[PDB]
Structure 1
Amino acid sequence: ATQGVFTLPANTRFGVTAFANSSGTQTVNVLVNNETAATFSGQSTNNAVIGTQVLNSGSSGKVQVQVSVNGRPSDLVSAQVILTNELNFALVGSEDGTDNDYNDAVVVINWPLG
């Protein structure tokens, strides 16, 4: 099944933050309505934030997270959780090899913002 794709409410601000836990440099690309809205990169084996930014979902509200290493498209796992019917978390984990460490790159999308 497709992973890393989320439908957010239209024209809404959301935060995107990426963490790295791999020996390899992680590249996180965020597409909003099929257009690159943010691109983060970094190397860390201690969960360092390699990028954090505030974006807007636009008309379609279609947000897609892609993760790659040296061009190598990483396999993703994802899900959305909503608490008390108002607080949203779109979560993504990625694997750059065969290590079931879908933690090589972790991406957290949250909304609404202040």
Structure 2
Amino acid sequence: ATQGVFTLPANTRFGVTAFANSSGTQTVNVLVNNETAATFSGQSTNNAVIGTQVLNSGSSGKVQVQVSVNGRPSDLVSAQVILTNELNFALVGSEDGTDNDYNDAVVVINWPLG
């Protein structure tokens, strides 16, 4: 199934934050209405916050997360969870190797903000 794609409410500010846990340099791209709105990169095996940014979901609400390492796309897993019918998290893990820890880049999207 497709992973790393979330439909947010339209024209809504959200946070996006990326953590690294791999010997490979991670590149995280965040697309809004199918175009790149943000790019984060770094290399850590201790969960460094390689990027964090506030974006707007735009008229479609479509947000997509992609991850690559040395130009090779990582395998993604994802889901969304809502607490008390109000607080949203869209969660992404990624695997760039063979050990299947799926933490090589971890991305958290959250809304509402403010």
Structure 1 portions without partners, runs of 5+: none
Q: CA deviation at 1:18?
A: 0.1
Q: Could you tell me how far apart the structure 2 residues matched to 1:63 and 1:43 are?
A: 24
Q: Could you tell me how far apart the structure 2 residues matched to 1:97 and 1:39 are?
A: 21
Q: CA deviation at 1:101?
A: 1.4
| Number of corresponding residues | 114
Q: CA deviation at 1:98?
A: 1.6
* TM-score, normalising length: structure 1: 0.99
Q: Could you tell me how far apart the structure 2 residues matched to 1:99 and 1:82 are?
A: 30
Q: Could you tell me how far apart the structure 1 residues matched to 2:104 and 2:76 are?
A: 10
Q: Could you tell me how far apart the structure 1 residues matched to 2:99 and 2:27 are?
A: 18
Structure 2 portions without partners, runs of 5+: none
Q: CA deviation at 1:9?
A: 0.1
Give 1:23's aligned residue.
23
Quick check: which one's strand share is greater?
A: 1
Runs of 4+ in 1 over 6 A off after TM superposition: none
Q: Could you tell me how far apart the structure 2 residues matched to 1:101 and 1:40 are?
A: 21
Q: Could you tell me how far apart the structure 1 residues matched to 2:98 and 2:55 are?
A: 32
Q: CA deviation at 1:60?
A: 0.3
